[PDB]
Design a protein around this ligand. Structure first.
Ligand SMILES: C[S@@](=O)CC[C@H](N)C(=O)O
Ligand SMILES: C[S@@](=O)CC[C@H](N)C(=O)O
Ligand SMILES: [Mg+2]
Ligand SMILES: [Mg+2]
Ligand SMILES: [Mg+2]
Ligand SMILES: [Mg+2]
Ligand SMILES: [Mg+2]
Ligand SMILES: [Mg+2]
Ligand SMILES: [Mg+2]
Ligand SMILES: [Mg+2]
Ligand SMILES: [Mg+2]
Lengths: 167, 167
């Protein structure tokens, strides 16, 4: 059975400890939802963010649809271009928000969130979904999170491709 | 935005408070995984159990496959008939475990859980998955949990069927 150690006190060092563990945990499963669910579990345990999880693109509706996550209840559907999530999708790149109250068109599924980061995932150069993380603290996410969650996105993208191949 | 109230300080009273809120939240989405994810979130926030979430039957492999959940990372696959989860599937009914150490063939995905409840979900007669909840406390789950998580199971079953008819 897999088990996770994370000892490191500095943010960047904790990512360097956590990412290889995630890689190992998801290497062992083809099911995409299972892998997203365990990913978000590892992130929540390691970093303690208020909310962390995924939305996946629905090509039929041009909406992000809620997938696995840790934290309180969330909105199920985010239109293309709306919110930090829909902005990330539209831009094709990561969005870091130091103060959600000061950010344009943030969607507040929780009144409690104050900062956020959204990292898009791609297959064949099309966005398939986003990783979203939220904090109750202002400015919880910075370039360290963008770098390492971007690397995690790459690891997950490969698992998405494995999930398609496994059908 | 959907938004939850938990006042109740007694377990049974809290189920009575929370089940209608879950029913409302899941009524307004057809995607099965989104609904499971938000249900796990509501249960985790309301009851604070160590782990709460779902496994879904994979008919290709005769295994339960990890779906949305809250709590630490978990096993991705449980064979038919193995563990509390596989036993609930094989029995076609709820299994309540007061102490995972006296239970035959408990699967310990975390070393920290001490008590558990599994409630199966059905469609067209057959098991489609299970709700599993785990606690670090002994005997956290009793007849109140069996009753009300069984009613939750039926609420969810109706959403599974609605997911198949949605367009
Ligand atoms: C999980 S919840 O915070 C998702 C919506 C997001 N804040 C956004 O602005 O898109
Ligand atoms: C989430 S984890 O505890 C799942 C396995 C379960 N205890 C079982 O015995 O089937
Ligand atoms: Mg996994
Ligand atoms: Mg999860
Ligand atoms: Mg909640
Ligand atoms: Mg549904
Ligand atoms: Mg829902
Ligand atoms: Mg969840
Ligand atoms: Mg069978
Ligand atoms: Mg018990
Ligand atoms: Mg209980």
């Amino acid at each position: 059975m897999h088990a996770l150690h994370f000892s490191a006190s500095d943010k960047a060092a904790l990512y360097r400890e956590v990412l290889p563990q995630i890689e190992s945990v998801v290497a062992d499963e083809t099911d995409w939802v299972a892998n997203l669910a365990n990913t978000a579990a590892v992130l929540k345990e390691a970093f303690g963010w208020f909310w962390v999880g995924f939305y996946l693109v629905d090509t039929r509706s041009d909406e992000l649809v809620l997938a696995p996550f840790q934290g309180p209840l969330a909105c199920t559907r985010i239109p293309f271009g709306r919110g930090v999530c829909g902005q990330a999708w539209a831009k094709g790149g990561t969005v870091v928000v130091g103060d959600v109250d000061a950010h344009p068109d943030h969607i507040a599924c929780s009144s409690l969130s104050r900062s956020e980061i959204v990292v898009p995932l791609f297959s064949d150069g099309r966005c398939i979904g986003v990783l979203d993380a939220d904090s109750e603290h202002l400015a919880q996410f910075d370039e360290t999170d963008a770098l390492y969650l971007g690397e995690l996105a790459k690891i997950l993208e490969k698992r998405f491709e494995a999930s398609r191949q496994a059908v």
